[PDB]
Design a protein around this nucleic acid. Sequence first.
RNA 1: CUUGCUCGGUUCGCCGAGACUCCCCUACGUGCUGCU
DNA 2: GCAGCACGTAGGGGAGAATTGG
DNA 3: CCAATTC
Length: 498
Amino acid sequence: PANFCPPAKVNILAQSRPLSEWPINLVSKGVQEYVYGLTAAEREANGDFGTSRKSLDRWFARTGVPTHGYTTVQGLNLILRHTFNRYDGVIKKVETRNEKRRSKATRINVSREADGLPPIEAEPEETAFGPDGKLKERPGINPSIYCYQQVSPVPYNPAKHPALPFSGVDPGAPLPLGTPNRLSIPKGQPGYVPEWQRPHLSTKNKRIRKWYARANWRRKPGRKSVLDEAKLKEAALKEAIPIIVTIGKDWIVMDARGLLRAVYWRGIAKPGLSLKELLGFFSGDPVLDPKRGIATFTFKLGAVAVHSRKPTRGKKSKELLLSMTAEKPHVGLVAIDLGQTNPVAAEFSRVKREGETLQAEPLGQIVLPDDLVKDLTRYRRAWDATEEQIKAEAIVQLPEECRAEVVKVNQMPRLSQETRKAVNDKTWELKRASTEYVRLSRRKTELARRCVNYIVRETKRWTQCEDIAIVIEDWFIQVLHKAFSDLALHRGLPVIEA
RNA sequence: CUUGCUCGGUUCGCCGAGACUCCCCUACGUGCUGCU
DNA sequence: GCAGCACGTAGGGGAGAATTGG
DNA sequence: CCAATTC
């Protein structure tokens, strides 16, 4: 059974007024502010919000949070049930910590009593509620508008909101296609491919980029062009695919080419689908993020063919391998070593079902290609270039009492195990606030995923088995392991860690 | 494979290659060594 | 058990849709 | 047509 729904993001094109001023957002902020700052005793009292119209009305009357015009049950049940589950998520953290600690006590003290040693005194189990009655780790406010069935995405029509400048396609007509005869464009027009790079044009299944894409005009050292933004923006808007969400009076318009690319690169839909089918591949409950301008869609349970399993290991590993050999009688295991010169070392195998046990059939070994290593080396140079900058910036801003000590640390004795916390926390804060650090932390994940996909592809060629298994053992080692472990969660392939 | 993101090439006309599980908020922790 | 390194980690909460009632 | 119930 399919039980994983990956995301897909689209861009907002037009708004009635900023997303933060919507009554849905204001009521969400009010409810979140009231529930979080109320003691444990009164949570039970104000915890009868109910899943009905009468219950919601009484909850708002007994409390004092401004209903702000918003009075829709579908949406208030999401604003409330989320807010109380977050409140019962700071209690649950301390509860699980104290449960692990009490289980440690139940083991150790009972073992000591069996050895004649009396149990030690019980610890002061931590409380999530501070001095008077309030949560110490107060949950923050979540800026997000969680859509529902009544406000689900619909294709645009001229008799929806006439103020929209750009046109809207027919919801029933088949969707357009990008320029298919790219070699038929005359010279001097957009999209012209000059007559010297025509031979070495890729014959693969590349994704097609239109000439006005930001990737073809971004400022990079080799690009001697102009990044005039207005022309590209209007050229893009002239060919958007508008879908629209209306909540009461306000409305927001999305460009749906993101969903098109999402269904195109995964292969769930071929060219020639309508907009109704395109929205069918996604849920009618998107999530809006007012800070960026994104709208995140998730696929329906059934669109993708991933089971989203867990990395089973140990005793269950042999049972899993026996079950898979009971399936298609050709399974290719791949074994990953890491920590040996290049980041990835792999070892192919094939396993059969010889009655009860397995019969491994070695197939060889593979080393990462050279271009991938070059990309990784360039990434390492970039990361070590930003690190020596952000760490220096963190050191500079230190208080003079700590600044002098840290300066001495660079000078030439190792001491002050009390400013280490200071430099650690401020380096963490700068890392969280450094956008270049965010990009160079996303590049690590992208490159690790490139490596993992390479190994997974080449373990289907050497073994010629559609079904595969992955073995890993418990720098790039951490990110590589994290990327490899995600395969069970993301793509369904087992990860038999041993 | 029409938007968005990342890396490279250029004759600057755009083309070769990638990822697609993502969001909020909160604490300060996780590994690796050295001695008991 | 308790220091010194380095480097981000851990763990709460999210992410719909059939029906039926005026 | 569009909210409100319900699992």
